[PDB]
Amino acid sequence: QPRWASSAAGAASTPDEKIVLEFMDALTSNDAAKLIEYFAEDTMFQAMPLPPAYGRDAVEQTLAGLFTVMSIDAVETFHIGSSNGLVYTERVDVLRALPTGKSYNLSILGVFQLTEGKITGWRDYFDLREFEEAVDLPLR
Amino acid sequence: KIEQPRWASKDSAAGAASTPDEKIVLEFMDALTSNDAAKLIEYFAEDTMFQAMPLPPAYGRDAVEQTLAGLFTVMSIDAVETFHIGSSNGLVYTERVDVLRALPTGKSYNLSILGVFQLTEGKITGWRDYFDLREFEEAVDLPL
Ligand SMILES: NCCC1(c2ccccc2)COC1
Ligand SMILES: NCCC1(c2ccccc2)COC1
Ligand code: NA
Ligand code: NA
Ligand code: NA
C-alpha cells in the first residue's frame, strides 16, 4: 500500500469508472474469451512496453498469449478518475509467472476509453524489466 | 511536433485543460523543457513526492529538487506532447510523449508516458510518471 495514496480518489464515481472496476475484477479470471466481451468492435489494447493490438480479434489473441505464462492474481486500485470519456487507474497488479511460481506487485497507471459502456481503448503504462527480473522471466 | 497516435481520442475536450489544476499541470509540462530543477520546484508543496516509477521515489521538497536536478544532468526534455489530460478528486492525469535526449550519448527518444499529479491548493503534492525505462535506455545507449 503506497505511501503516496491520496478520499474519494479511490472510489469509482460514474458508470464508466464502475465498469472499469468491474473489468479489473474480471481480469483475475485469466480468461481472454470472457474478457473480450468488455471491448467494443472499434477497440485497441496496449501494454505499453509491447506492441499494440487493434480490433477485438487481435486484442483477444494478445491477452490469451499473456495469460499462457502469467496469472493476474489480484488488482488493487489506489486511484480512479475520469474526464472526457477516458478513465484513469493508478493500481498494482499482482502478477504471478506461471513457469517460475514467482509473484510481483507491478505498479501500473492505465487509461481506458469507453463508448456506450464498452472499452474502445486500454493502455497500461509500467516498467517491464522490473517485472521480468522479479519473476525470472523475460517477456519481450 | 509529434505524430498523433492512432488511439488518440478525437473528442477535443480530452486533450484540453478544463480545470485550474489541469491548467497548472499543462504549464508545468511546458516548464519541464527549461531543464531547471529550481524553476520546477516552485510548483511543489513542502509535503510532496516525486517518482519516475522505474526508479526510487523522493519524498519532501528538498529530495525532489535534488532528484530533478540529478535527472537534468543526464537528460534533457526537449519537448512534451500531451494527448490526453483529465482529473478527478484532486488528481490530474496526463497521457503524453516526452522527447528525451540523453546528454552523455547525444541520442533522443520519444518516450510514451502516463503521469499522475496530486494537487492541494494549487501546489504539487505528488508527481509519478509511468513508462518503460529499458526501451529508453536501449534507444539512447545509456544504461540507467
Ligand atoms: N497491462 C496490460 C497487461 C496486463 C496483463 C494482461 C493480460 C494478461 C497478463 C497481464 C495487465 O497488467 C499486466
Ligand atoms: N518520467 C519522469 C521523469 C522525466 C524527467 C523529469 C525530470 C528530469 C528528467 C526526466 C519525465 O519524463 C522523464
Ligand atoms: Na475517484
Ligand atoms: Na473529471
Ligand atoms: Na481533457
Residue numbers in the entry:
A (entry chain A): 7 to 12, 15 to 148
B (entry chain B): 4 to 147
The study reports:
We report an in silico strategy for the biocatalytic synthesis of chiral N- and O-heterocycles via Baldwin cyclization modes of hydroxy- and amino-substituted epoxides and oxetanes using the limonene epoxide hydrolase from Rhodococcus erythropolis. We turned to cofactor-independent limonene epoxide hydrolases (LEHs) that normally catalyze direct hydrolysis of epoxides by positioning and activating water at the active site. On the basis of the well-documented mechanism of ReLEH, a water molecular is positioned by H-bonds to N55 and Y53 while D132 abstracts a proton from the water, enabling a smooth nucleophilic attack on one of the substrate’s epoxide carbon center. We have rationally engineered the epoxide hydrolase ReLEH with construction of a general platform for Baldwin cyclization reactivity of hydroxy- and amino-epoxides and oxetanes.
To further elucidate the mechanism, crystallographic experiments were performed. We obtained the complex crystals of SZ611-substrate 59 and SZ611-product 46 using the soaking methods as described in Material and Methods. SZ611 assembles into a homodimer structure with four α-helices and five-strand β-sheets in each monomer, forming a cavity that serves as a deep substrate-binding pocket, in which a substituent of substrate 59 or of product 46 can occur without steric repulsion. The electron density map of such ligands and surrounding key residues were defined with good quality. A major portion of substrate 59 was clearly defined in the electron density map, apart from a minor portion of the phenyl group. The N-atom of substrate 59 is hydrogen-bonded to D132, which commonly functioned as a proton receptor for the deprotonation of an amine group, or for deprotonation of water molecules in WT LEH and other LEH mutants. Product 46 shares a similar conformation with substrate 59 considering the hydrogen-bonding networks of amines and hydroxyl groups with D132 and D101, which together predicts a pathway for the LEH-catalyzed selective desymmetrization reactions of oxetanes. In the catalytic reactions, residue D132 acts as a proton acceptor to promote the deprotonation of the amino group. The deprotonated N-atom then nucleophilically attacks the oxetane moiety, resulting in ring opening, followed by the protonation of the O-atom of the oxetane precursor with D101 as the proton donor. For the desymmetric oxetane reactions, we propose a putative catalytic pathway, which mainly includes the following crucial processes: (1) deprotonation of the amine group; (2) nucleophilic attack of carbon atom (C2) of the oxetane; (3) protonation of oxygen atom of oxetane.
